[PDB]
Structures are given as structure tokens and as C-alpha cells.
Design a binder for these strands. Structure first.
Length: 580
DNA sequence: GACCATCCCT
DNA sequence: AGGAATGGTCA
């Protein structure tokens, strides 16, 4: 039943071949400064299981890990590389990462281990990690005999599956996408994560003090105005005070009871003073739980740093996501919350944070793919696009655009981006579909090319079964041909949206790779810290700011060539907050 | 341990 | 259109 492997107690010369499938196993979910539990190598000479202590103490092994000339096939190499970075070891030569290769072929399958990736091509000579390691309170590294076998099986799997995966990719015209975009990007992310971002804790802790006092005030009020105490954070308990005791109008039901979202409470404010106090409490509460307490809990005390993990093979569109902490949802919209960014600071002395963002990248991508003339023009003029849209759909001159007319031409614009229907717009603008379709009809009259795109795209999705991005990312939409209207329409929104959202991910991903090449060429010390969807955040010495101001937007703006110009803006300052 | 509902970002 | 983290809940 077993798979044959030498359980090596010493590193021999035949374990160091030029081509190999390697496994450096890090069971911990958060791999930052995480133990490596075992190692397996498979190559032309055999199958080997090496204990970390033995192997990682071996100058010959660690030299093989670092040699770029020695090519290694792997599953989720970033996990491996970071875990080794924390131990002063560099991993190079990884020319094939199956996790990223599975992800490119079909992001829907949710590949998250070798077993899942293996089934894709009908190979099942390997177990689901969860099967070996357990789950949750049961998670545990097993004994050496079981471990070594599993690890060798994974390795064997990778060795087996490379050629078939790489062949399919090529058919799909995604071979370069793997080797030139996603894999090279894997390295940059490794470094970004390892580096981390410094957190001024005292600053954070003080904010935690002020909030604690402010929440204590609002809380008391709420109970006073309620004439009672209850768990304000309970959707069920609160829904009893609002909709039963104070007889507030039920404007919405959730699946399990009445809805107490901000949207509902905003409308109920005129009826009772308790409402404003609840929303105020929720705002200050979110900040306390997620942005002061949640953060201080993941700051490493040793370096006062946070090292996020960037998931590269998770999002359905090609975007990244970051975890523990999520450094892509730090509050910026309201001033109270925006001040949480004062706690993100440069890691050295005399350094500054530097933020470069893309200006309306999505809509610029739409302009390019749809080839809409009116829209291409608007961008060649570097116009305010919301004002411009307000001018066209409402048939007025620049000076006639009122603030609300602009607020709505915005709502629509993102409607178009998301492929939204009258109904989605209706609620979004607070109105009715009878009038929401009038805007839409009116939009497509000023933008015949975008209309033309929505039609062609849904149809190609219908015919081909998938939609593609500029750089060849792919999304299968099996639900497009569904008979259920809800399920059909949603797939159509995806057909419409994914090439836009996903071509934007590709572009910034390419930027990131170009930025790295240049930072190195220019011998600048500036290092890339975060990526927030259309934004790159760096920290550099104060001396380098001036060059970065000219260098970063140019590398970004030049990442690809669309029919409309790309436009970047930048800022910098003592803290992240100030990079505004 | 999963779900839910709520809220934060692009 | 894509994501992630929390407290409550009932299990």
C-alpha cells in the first residue's frame, strides 16, 4: 500500500539534483516564524524524507536551496520561502508552483492543497491535508511514519503533475502568465510579508483609551434612552428594543429576524434619539474590536511589526487578499477611523511612508476594452469622469452639474463597472427600477460602446464558457446558461465585471514586478510594503522621496499600454495617515 | 465549530 | 463586482 522512500538521516549527494520536486512543510496556518515539521524531495534518483534539523543544519542542503540553477517544483512556495526567511535561509530556483498553476486554470475549484489540485487531473495517490493533520482543536502533526509518507506523497504528486499542468496552461495561453507574472510576483510578496510594517503601539493603545471612554459614554446613554440594559451587539436583543419596545417601523427583515443594519437605522433616526446613539456606538465599536484590539493582538512584540499574509490563489478575479491582519481594509473614509493609520509608521529612523495609487483604473480599463469613443475621449482629456457622466446622462453643461447629480452619476458608474441591474442601482440610489433603467438606457445612449461591450461579453461568456482578462486570467461561468433568473443574471454581472476588475489586478501585478526591477537597478533602499488593490505603499529614506516621486508613477503608468493613458497620484509623510 | 449579521476596504 | 474580521448564537 505504502510508497517507497528512503527515510534519510543524512544528506547525500544524490538528494541535490538540478531538477526536483520539494516539500518544506509548515503546518501552522500563519507561517510567519512557524516551525518546519518535515521535508521531502523527489527527483530522478528517488524519494527522500529529511528531518528539518538534519537537513537545515547541512551546508550542502542549504546551498542547494539557495542555488537558482537548481530547479525545484513546489506547492505554495511562498509559505516555504517565508518560513525559511525567518530562519536565515533563502529559497531560490522554484520554477514551478502547482498551487499557483492550479489557481490559474480554475479559480473556482478552490484548490488549497496538493490533494485538491491533484484530483483536477485524476490523481489521488495523496491525501487532503485536513485528513492527515486533522482540523481545529484536533489539528496535530502525527508521528514520523505517517508524516514522512504524506510528505513524500505530496512531493511525488508534484513531480507527477508538472508536465500536465504546464501543458494545459500552454493550451490556454497562460504559460507566460505563470512563469512571468504570478510566480515572479510570489517572491516580491514573500519579501513584502517578511519585511512587515511597523506599528506605533503606544499611539494605538492611546486611541484604545479614548475609545474606551467614548463607548462607555454612548453605552450608558443607549441604556438610558432605552430605559434598560441589553447586549447592544446582539442583532436579536437590539431588534427587540427597537422594533418591539419602542415600536420602530420594520423596514427590513433579515433571513433570521428584523434587520438592524446602518441603512435601516439611518431611516429610523427621526423617530427616536436612541438610533443616532446606536450607529455612533457601532462605529466606535468596530474600531475597538477590529482596528485597535484586533491589531494590537497581531503585532509581534519582538519587533512591533505586523506581517500580513497575502493570499495570491484565492480571489475569483485575480486580485490579492491579505490576512491576519487584513491590511487592505484599514479605515480611510471617515476621519475618526482614518486616524488609525497614524499608527502605521516607517520601520527605520528618518524614513517616510510613500503611497502611489491609480486614478480610476477600472473605468480606464473599461474605456480600453469596450473601445467606447466618448469614454476614451473623457480619459484623454483627463476629465473628472463622474462630472462628465453627470453631464451626459442628465444633458447639462459643466456648470449645471449639481453635487447630487454627481453623486448619482457616480453610483451609476460603479453600477456599470459591476454590471449592475436596475434593481441593484435602485436600492443603491434609494429609488425604483422603473427609473433606474431610465438612467441605464440614458447611459448607454452616451456610451454605445460600453453597451456594445456588455452584450458581446455576456455572449462570449455564453459561447466560450469563460471570460478572460488582458493578461489571460480566466473565469469559468457555468451558471451563465442557467434557467433560474437570479443565478443567470449574477453570472452575467460577472461576465461583465471580471474582465475589468481582473485586468486591473493584472496591471498592478505587472507594475509591482517592474517596480522591483527598477528599485534594484536604481540601487534605492525603498521597499515595497503593501498592495491595496490599486495602490502601492512603500517606505524609504527621506533622501529617496524625491526620486520615488518621479520613479513610482512612471513604472506604474507604464506597466501596460492601453488606448487611454494611465494616471497615478502619489503622497508621502511621516505616517501612513499622512501619505494622503 | 459553523453560521449569521454587521461593517471595514477597493 | 471582489475580499476579511468580529461578536453573538445555538450546537
Amino acid at each position: 500500500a505504502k510508497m517507497a522512500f528512503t527515510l534519510a538521516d543524512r544528506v547525500t549527494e544524490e538528494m541535490l539534483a538540478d531538477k526536483a520536486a520539494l516539500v518544506v512543510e509548515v503546518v501552522e496556518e500563519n507561517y510567519h516564524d512557524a516551525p518546519i515539521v518535515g521535508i521531502a524531495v523527489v527527483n530522478e534518483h528517488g524519494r527522500f524524507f529529511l528531518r528539518p534539523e538534519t537537513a537545515l543544519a547541512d551546508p550542502q542542503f542549504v546551498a542547494w536551496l539557495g542555488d537558482e540553477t537548481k530547479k525545484k517544483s513546489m506547492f505554495d512556495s511562498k509559505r516555504a520561502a517565508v518560513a525559511l526567511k525567518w530562519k536565515g535561509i533563502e529559497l531560490c530556483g522554484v520554477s514551478f508552483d502547482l498551487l499557483l498553476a492550479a489557481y490559474l486554470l480554475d479559480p473556482a475549484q478552490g484548490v488549497d492543497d496538493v490533494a485538491a489540485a491533484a484530483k483536477m487531473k485524476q490523481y489521488e495517490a495523496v491525501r487532503p491535508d485536513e485528513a492527515v493533520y486533522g482540523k481545529g482543536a484536533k489539528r496535530a502533526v502525527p508521528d514520523e511514519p505517517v508524516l514522512a509518507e504524506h510528505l513524500v506523497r505530496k512531493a511525488a504528486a508534484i513531480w507527477a503533475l508538472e508536465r500536465p499542468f504546464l501543458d494545459e496552461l500552454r493550451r490556454n495561453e497562460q504559460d507566460r502568465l505563470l512563469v512571468e507574472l504570478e510566480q515572479p510576483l510570489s517572491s516580491i510578496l514573500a519579501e513584502m510579508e517578511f519585511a512587515g510594517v511597523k506599528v506605533d503601539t503606544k499611539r494605538l493603545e492611546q486611541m484604545g483609551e479614548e475609545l474606551a471612554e467614548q463607548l462607555r459614554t454612548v453605552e450608558q446613554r443607549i441604556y438610558e434612552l432605552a430605559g434598560q440594559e441589553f447586549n447592544i451587539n446582539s442583532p436579536k436583543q437590539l431588534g427587540v428594543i427597537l422594533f418591539e419596545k419602542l415600536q420602530l417601523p420594520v423596514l427590513k427583515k433579515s433571513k433570521t429576524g428584523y434587520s438592524t443594519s446602518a441603512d435601516v437605522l439611518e431611516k429610523l433616526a427621526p423617530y427616536h434619539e436612541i438610533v443616532e446613539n446606536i450607529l455612533h456606538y457601532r462605529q466606535l465599536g468596530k474600531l475597538q474590536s477590529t482596528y485597535i484590539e484586533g491589531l494590537l493582538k497581531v503585532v509581534r512584540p519582538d519587533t512591533k511589526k505586523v506581517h500580513t499574509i497575502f493570499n495570491q490563489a484565492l480571489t475569483q478575479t485575480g486580485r490579492l487578499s491579505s490576512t491576519e491582519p487584513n491590511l487592505q481594509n484599514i479605515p480611510i473614509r471617515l476621519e475618526e477611523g482614518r486616524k488609525i493609520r497614524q499608527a502605521f509608521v516607517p520601520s527605520e529612523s528618518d524614513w517616510l511612508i510613500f503611497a502611489a495609487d491609480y486614478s480610476q483604473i477600472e473605468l480606464r480599463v473599461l474605456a480600453h476594452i469596450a473601445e467606447d469613443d466618448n469614454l476614451m475621449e473623457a480619459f484623454r482629456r483627463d476629465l473628472d469622469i463622474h462630472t462628465k457622466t453627470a453631464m451626459d446622462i442628465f444633458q447639462v453643461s459643466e456648470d449645471e452639474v449639481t453635487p447630487n447629480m454627481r453623486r448619482q452619476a457616480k453610483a451609476v458608474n460603479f453600477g456599470i463597472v459591476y454590471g449592475i441591474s436596475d434593481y441593484g442601482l435602485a436600492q443603491n440610489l434609494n429609488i425604483s427600477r422603473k427609473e433606474a433603467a431610465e438612467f441605464i438606457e440614458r447611459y448607454f445612449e452616451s456610451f454605445p460602446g460600453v453597451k456594445r461591450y456588455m452584450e458581446n461579453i455576456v455572449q462570449e461568456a455564453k459561447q466560450k464558457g469563460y471570460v478572460t482578462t488582458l493578461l489571460h486570467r480566466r473565469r469559468y461561468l457555468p451558471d451563465i446558461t442557467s434557467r433560474n433568473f437570479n443565478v443567470r443574471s449574477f453570472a452575467e454581472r460577472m461576465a461583465m465585471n471580471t474582465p475589468i476588475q481582473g485586468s486591473a489586478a493584472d496591471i498592478i501585478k505587472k507594475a509591482m514586478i517592474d517596480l522591483n526591477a527598477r528599485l534594484k537597478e536604481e540601487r534605492l533602499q525603498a521597499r515595497l510594503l503593501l498592495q491595496v488593490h490599486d495602490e502601492l505603499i512603500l517606505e524609504a529614506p527621506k533622501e529617496e522621496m524625491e526620486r520615488l516621486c518621479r520613479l513610482v508613477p512612471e513604472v506604474m503608468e507604464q506597466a501596460v499600454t492601453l488606448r487611454v493613458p494611465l494616471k497615478v497620484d502619489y503622497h508621502y509623510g511621516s505616517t501612513w495617515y499622512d501619505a494622503k
